[PDB]
């Protein structure tokens, strides 16, 4: 969700995924195919979807975190200054970036929990497997 | 007539037959009827 | 895939031109088909041959085959649909070639057959629709089943002689 300590406000810009492997921590993952701003609430929505499906255990890796602060229009005007500190927190996601990864669940169990979590996301996603050992 | 703009399989009985420019369904159970218009 | 076509006894097939006219003892049938799809006699029985083997022709293959297989069956064996009336006081009589049914409607229902189909009633709770053309026979017995379809509570109405009806029950 939100961050503990900060600066308050930010900006905006985009280009292809910088730091997102394929198989770190988990066995199966969920990768972005489009750029977006992942709201804290959309991640929470995806997490609960997966957590419910995998009833007991807890083997969900959320490799993305909402750190970017977004602002708002009080109600009207423009005849004032820069605005709304407390609108919402965001994770800048670019295609390739592993957002989530699961462990201790079958190919079929994972296929679905990701198919479900996909319906809650503002972008198109792809389900993946192993064979990526870059640098450790 | 349950107009769901997304006609996907629910059980192992559903039949997706293409008709007059739409994604239709002719399932066994009468409640399971899905169409896109 | 569909290939063999059995042509028994007094068959007079004349697949010349686009008029694939099939004559016989029960009556002389006439049916038009595709020109780009080949058909004639290459032995004792019959066969429909398709040139292209893509997708558009494969659909028309099994179509033309079964259609002459139904016209041939029609000229020798013929066709007869057996319909059964179900429900309190539901009964059918006859007024010439016309089927006079009494099926819980304030004024009785009369159906006049087309030129080539015949109505028959053995017991007055059974209707037989016999004809030459399987399509027209289907299209007619279709209209009779429509006069009163079997309802999802007591199966009342016109059903096929051996038809199975699932039942809901409200009270």
């Amino acid at each position: 969700k939100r961050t503990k300590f900060r600066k308050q406000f930010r900006g905006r810009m985009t280009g292809d995924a910088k730091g997102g492997d394929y198989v770190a921590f988990g066995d199966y993952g969920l990768i972005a195919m489009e750029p977006a701003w992942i709201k804290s609430n959309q991640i929470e929505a995806c997490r609960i979807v997966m957590s419910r499906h995998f009833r007991r255990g807890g083997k969900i890796y959320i490799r993305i975190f909402p750190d970017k602060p977004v602002t708002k229009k009080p109600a009207e005007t423009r005849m004032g200054k820069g605005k709304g500190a407390v609108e919402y927190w965001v994770s800048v996601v670019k295609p390739g970036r592993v957002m989530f990864e699961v462990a201790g669940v079958t190919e079929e169990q994972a296929k679905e929990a990701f198919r479900l979590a996909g319906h809650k996301l503002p972008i198109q996603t792809k389900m993946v497997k192993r064979e990526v050992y870059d640098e450790a | 007539m349950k107009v769901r703009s997304s006609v996907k399989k629910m059980c192992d009985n559903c039949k997706v037959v293409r008709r007059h420019g739409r994604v239709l369904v002719i399932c066994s159970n009468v409640k399971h009827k899905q169409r896109q218009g | 895939g569909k290939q063999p076509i059995a042509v028994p006894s007094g068959v007079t097939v004349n697949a010349q031109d686009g008029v694939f006219k099939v004559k016989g003892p029960k009556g002389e049938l006439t049916v038009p088909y595709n020109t780009e799809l080949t058909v004639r006699q290459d032995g004792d029985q019959l066969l429909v041959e398709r040139p292209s083997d893509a997708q558009k022709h494969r659909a028309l293959h099994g179509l033309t085959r079964t259609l002459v297989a139904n016209a041939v069956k029609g000229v020798s064996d013929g066709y007869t649909i057996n319909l059964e009336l179900r429900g309190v006081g539901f009964r059918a009589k006859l007024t010439g070639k016309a089927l006079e049914m009494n099926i819980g409607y304030s004024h009785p229902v009369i159906i006049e057959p087309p030129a080539g189909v015949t109505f028959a009633v053995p017991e007055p709770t059974r209707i037989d629709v016999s004809g030459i053309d399987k399509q027209l026979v289907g299209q007619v017995a279709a209209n009779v089943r429509k006069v009163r379809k079997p309802d999802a509570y007591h199966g009342k109405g016109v059903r096929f002689v051996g038809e199975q009806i699932a039942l809901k029950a409200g009270k």
Binding site: D16, R56, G57, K59, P95, A136 | - | -
Partner: protein, 175 residues
Amino acid sequence: MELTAKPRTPKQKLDESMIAAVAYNKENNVSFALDRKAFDRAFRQQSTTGLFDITVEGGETFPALVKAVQMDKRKRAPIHVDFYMVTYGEPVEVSVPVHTTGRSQGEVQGGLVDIVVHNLQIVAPGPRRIPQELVVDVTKMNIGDHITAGDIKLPEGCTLAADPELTVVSVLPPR
């Protein structure tokens, strides 16, 4: 596996079903270009704990082990391969897949086997004496059991490149 050309401009191969390659040791570090389809069917089997000979179009056979691969980020597809020429007597540190055998006596109560280290770096192994896997029995394990590196049975001559107190396999509780 059969290589073909070797130009600096990849324009010729890019359009076709070919993947750029490189093989080095310290005496010869030539340019390369092999088949995508053929590489994949083979690599999916082999990885870092396996090797195959690469015979370039001119009759020159050389044994090489994969050092690193670089794939497209928007696609799954690999776009370049780094092969390392094999000596015969002494090699380098190799990443070996850590595997599990037998159902745990900790996975019963409400646990789960967490393979903390997917691939292990191992010092002084021996070339062509490289183990294609690394099986670790887990039946002895209960909830709260951590198997460290200095608790793993290596196959003859091999030594460990990682710390001996570092967790490789653990059995995890519910929720």
